[PDB]
Amino acid sequence: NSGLHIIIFDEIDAICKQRGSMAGSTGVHDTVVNQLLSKIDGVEQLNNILVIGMTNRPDLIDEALLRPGRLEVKMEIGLPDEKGRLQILHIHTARMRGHQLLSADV
Amino acid sequence: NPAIFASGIIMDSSISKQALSEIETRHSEIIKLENSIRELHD
Amino acid sequence: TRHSEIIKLENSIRELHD
Amino acid sequence: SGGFIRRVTNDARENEMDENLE
Amino acid sequence: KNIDSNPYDTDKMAAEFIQQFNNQAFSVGQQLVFSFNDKLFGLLVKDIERQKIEVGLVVGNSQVAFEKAENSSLNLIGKAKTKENRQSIINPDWNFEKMGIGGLDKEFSDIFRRAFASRVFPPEIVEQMGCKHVKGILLYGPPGCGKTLLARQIGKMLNAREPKVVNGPEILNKYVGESEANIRKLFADAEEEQRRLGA
Ligand SMILES: Nc1ncnc2c1ncn2[C@@H]1O[C@H](COP(=O)(O)OP(=O)(O)OP(=O)(O)O)[C@@H](O)[C@H]1O
Numbered sequence: 529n530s531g532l533h534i535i536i537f538d539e540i541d542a543i544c545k546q547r548g549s550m551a552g553s554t555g556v557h558d559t560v561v562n563q564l565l566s567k568i569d570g571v572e573q574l575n576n577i578l579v580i581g582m583t584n585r586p587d588l589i590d591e592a593l594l595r596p597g598r599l600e601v602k603m604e605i606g607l608p609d610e611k612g613r614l615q616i617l618h619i620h621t622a623r624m625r626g627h628q629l630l631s632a633d634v
Numbered sequence: 635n636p637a638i639f640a641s642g643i644i645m646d647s648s649i650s651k652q653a654l655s656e657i658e659t660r661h662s663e664i665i666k667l668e669n670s671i672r673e674l675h676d
Numbered sequence: 677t678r679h680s681e682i683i684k685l686e687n688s689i690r691e692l693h694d
Numbered sequence: 695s696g697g698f699i700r701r702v703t704n705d706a707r708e709n710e711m712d713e714n715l716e
Numbered sequence: 717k718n719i720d721s722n723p724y725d726t727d728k729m730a731a732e733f734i735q736q737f738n739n740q741a742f743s744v745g746q747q748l749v750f751s752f753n754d755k756l757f758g759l760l761v762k763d764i765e766r767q768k769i770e771v772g773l774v775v776g777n778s779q780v781a782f783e784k785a786e787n788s789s790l791n792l793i794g795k796a797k798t799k800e801n802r803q804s805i806i807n808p809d810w811n812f813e814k815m816g817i818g819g820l821d822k823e824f825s826d827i828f829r830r831a832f833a834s835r836v837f838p839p840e841i842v843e844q845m846g847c848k849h850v851k852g853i854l855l856y857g858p859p860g861c862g863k864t865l866l867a868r869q870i871g872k873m874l875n876a877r878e879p880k881v882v883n884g885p886e887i888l889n890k891y892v893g894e895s896e897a898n899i900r901k902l903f904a905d906a907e908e909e910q911r912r913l914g915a
Pocket of ligand 1: 597864
C-alpha cells in the first residue's frame with residue numbers, strides 16, 4: 529500500500545555502455561553499471577518504481593540491462609506518415625484558427 | 635601512432651571525524667589537570 | 677594502562693591536597 | 695605505565711607528549 | 717527478550733537443576749523457573765519415573781532430560797535428549813521443489829554432493845581422515861538463468877541462520893582503509909563466534 533515513484537533518464541548510453549571490455553578506460557563506468565544493475569533488481573524486490581529511458585543508439589546499451597524483468601517494453605519511433613503530418617499541422621494551427629487570425633485561402 | 639591520454643582520481647586521505655573527533659574530545663580532560671596544578675601552586 | 681596511570685595520579689594529587 | 699597518549703596521527707608531535715607527561 | 721541459540725551442557729544443566737531443586741516435590745504439569753548460565757528458563761514438568769508417578773521427589777541421583785519447546789531455537793546437546801530434536805542437521809525438512817525452481821536437478825545434486833557431503837557424516841570419519849573442507853563456490857552463465865534465486869534459496873536450504881548480503885561494490889569508499897575496516901567487520905563476527913565455540 530504505497531504510492532508510485534517515477535525516474536527519468538536522458539541519454540542513457542552516456543553512463544551505461546558495454547560492461548567492462550572497452551579496453552580504453554575502466555575508471556568508474558564498470559562500477560556505475562554494476563551498481564545500477566544490482567540496485568534496480570537485486571536480492572530485494574521493489575514494486576513502486578518505474579524507469580523510462582531514452583536513446584538514439586539502441587545497439588550500444590548493455591544487453592544484461594535489457595533482458596526481461598528490468599527493461600522489457602522497447603519502442604522504435606518512426607517518421608510520421610501523411611495523416612500524422614496533417615494531424616500535427618492541425619494541432620499546431622488550432623490556436624491560430626481560434627482567434628481567426630488565419631486567411632481563408634490557407 | 636603513439637598518442638595516449640589519461641584521467642586520474644584524487645583522494646581525501648582518511649579524516650572521517652572519528653579519529654579527529656576522538657582526539658579533539660579526549661583533549662578536554664587535560665584542562666582539568668591544568669586547573670588543578672594551577673590551584674595547587676597558588 | 678591509561679586508567680591505571682590516570683587514577684594513580686588522581687589519587688596522588690588528591691592525597692597531596694588533603 | 696604502558697602509555698599516555700594514543701596516536702591519532704603517526705607524527706612526531708605525539709611522541710614527546712608521552713615523555714613530557716611522564 | 718533473552719533468547720539464545722548457544723549450546724547447553726545438558727549434564728551440567730541437569731546437575732544444577734537437581735542441586736537447586738533437591739528435597740523438592742514435583743508434579744506432572746508443574747511449571748517453574750530455573751537459572752542456568754545466568755539465564756532464566758521456563759521448565760514444564762512432563763513425565764516422571766520403571767513405574768510412572770504423578771508426584772515425585774527430586775534427589776541428587778535423579779536425572780532430568782530436557783525437551784525444547786515447539787519452534788524454539790534452544791539447542792540442547794549431549795545425551796539427555798528426548799523426543800524429536802533438530803537444531804544442527806544438514807538434512808532438514810527443506811524440499812527442493814516447493815521453492816518453484818526450474819530444471820536444475822543435476823546442478824543441485826552436484827552442489828549438495830560436492831559441498832554439504834563433508835558436514836553430514838559424524839566428526840569421527842573426518843577427524844580420522846584429517847582433511848579440510850571447501851570454503852568457496854562460484855557460478856556463471858548467461859543472464860536470467862537463476863543464479864540469484866538459486867543462491868538465496870541455498871541460503872535458506874542449509875539449517876543455519878540468515879546470511880549477509882553484499883549488494884554490489886558498496887565496499888569502496890573515499891576514505892582509504894575504511895574498506896579494510898568494513899571487510900574486517902564483515903568477518904569479525906564469524907571469527908569471534910568460532911573462537912568462542914571451538915571446533
Ligand atoms: N529457472 C527459473 N525458473 C523460474 N524463474 C526464473 C528462473 N530463472 C530465472 N527466473 C526469473 O528470473 C527473475 C530475475 O532473474 P534472476 O534473479 O533469477 O537471474 P540471475 O540468474 O540472478 O541472473 P542476472 O542477475 O545475471 O540477470 C526472477 O524473478 C525469476 O522469476
